[PDB]
Design a binder for this molecule. Structure first.
Ligand SMILES: N=C1N[C@H]2[C@H](CS[C@H]2CCCCC(=O)O)N1
Ligand SMILES: N=C1N[C@H]2[C@H](CS[C@H]2CCCCC(=O)O)N1
Ligand SMILES: N=C1N[C@H]2[C@H](CS[C@H]2CCCCC(=O)O)N1
Ligand SMILES: N=C1N[C@H]2[C@H](CS[C@H]2CCCCC(=O)O)N1
Lengths: 123, 121, 123, 121
């Protein structure tokens, strides 16, 4: 549901995610990371299943943040792939891939993988 | 390198995606796959880092495709994270995560991972 | 440290992991999964850093379980890659890859990725 | 297919691993890489599913290498998960996770992921 995803979310690292889910399946907002070579807010863009299922299945979504803004440029991009689960305590459980640009030679070590869980605070 | 991300790319599977790279880091376009519960074009939105470094590194980027369009809804979304490299043969090398919406009970098996290499050939 | 890893561990799904860390960096034991097309115990083999660092850095390790025993055969294998962190509450935090054998055609969907956290109960 | 996993394999990077596949699912051998804080041979231990299905599927397997030997200790371990396929050109297609031991503080960036294809060429 767009509404349910829309809001302010935080994860276990202390990062802030502000997103708006649009009617057409779009996600736009800004990400504030608590870690990494990242300072201030970064623009995020993603997509979600505007028409999930009835049942108590999560809503699949994903989004990308390139870590370049007017203050910094880490030359990397992270994509989070997960599911939104609503209820009294809504969560977005994700797995992410962080790719740094590298020379052909170090391309084998350009991507990190992890997982983040977000808890909603505001709409 | 710059601009050159813009165009039509194809992968091993036969998938095709057309993207437009905007001066400030946005990626917009459509994705048409060859495998899965997919049928036609899907909208894709991503970001790419517009000021890559000047050591011969690739340009980091990523995009998402929710697999829902006016014809099908596979209740899943794929995110590709990778880097673009130009030259006589430009390619985008990526790793992807495909998450399907599941009930709590099947959450452990909701995400597939793979890799795709796209070229303009 | 071999000792610290040796023991009985459980994760959030309810699976049992019984492992012995040998002096030479080896890990052997059995895995009892609570989910999947898996019944009874399965043999596991892995390796760990017998000489970690001083500091409060985790000990990197990894192990594999092919899901075939005398009772079942899911034709898949899972490898867990993570770190052991000791202390009063020792944990093994991992990320895993589950690959199912497939035809060339469905190879794109042969691997699942997730993460498990194990808590120690016994040696 | 069976037995055929046993042998010497090489990957794109130039890494080489020699493995022995035992009748009951064990994989044993040595791994020598071409990249990273690695120097010489490392011991590898894995498992492979000894009764693959009879639809033309690959044989699922996986192995681990802790990057410590008598010469170096990179305080990391790599696990490769994939499947073997035989034929005139047998190959092992894998995806790997490389975890480095870190302090809690850097736990978020402890694991790299990639893919390797090994052939006997
Ligand atoms: N809030 C989170 N931040 C880290 C993880 C996923 S992306 C990462 C921050 C990286 C910042 C930029 C960088 O270091 O390249 N979750
Ligand atoms: N070009 C690719 N197609 C498959 C992989 C990653 S995304 C995937 C197609 C999935 C279609 C929808 C589905 O089956 O859920 N790469
Ligand atoms: N204890 C765990 N079991 C599931 C995850 C990782 S492997 C998986 C069980 C799979 C069983 C065999 C199968 O279904 O193929 N953790
Ligand atoms: N053949 C491969 N070599 C690199 C990738 C995955 S494992 C890795 C070598 C790592 C060496 C030790 C290290 O740098 O930590 N594939």
């Amino acid at each position: 549901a767009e509404a349910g995803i829309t809001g302010t979310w935080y994860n276990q690292l202390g990062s802030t995610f502000i997103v708006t889910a649009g009617a057409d399946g779009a996600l736009t907002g800004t990400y504030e990371s608590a870690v990494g070579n990242a300072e201030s807010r970064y623009v995020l863009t993603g997509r979600y299943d505007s028409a999930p299922a009835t049942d108590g299945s999560g809503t699949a979504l994903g989004w990308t943040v390139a870590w370049k803004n007017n203050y910094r440029n880490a030359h990397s991009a992270t994509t989070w792939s997960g599911q939104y689960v609503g209820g009294a305590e809504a969560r977005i459980n994700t797995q992410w891939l962080l790719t740094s640009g590298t020379t052909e030679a170090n391309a084998w070590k350009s991507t990190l993988v992890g997982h983040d869980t977000f808890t909603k605070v505001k709409p």
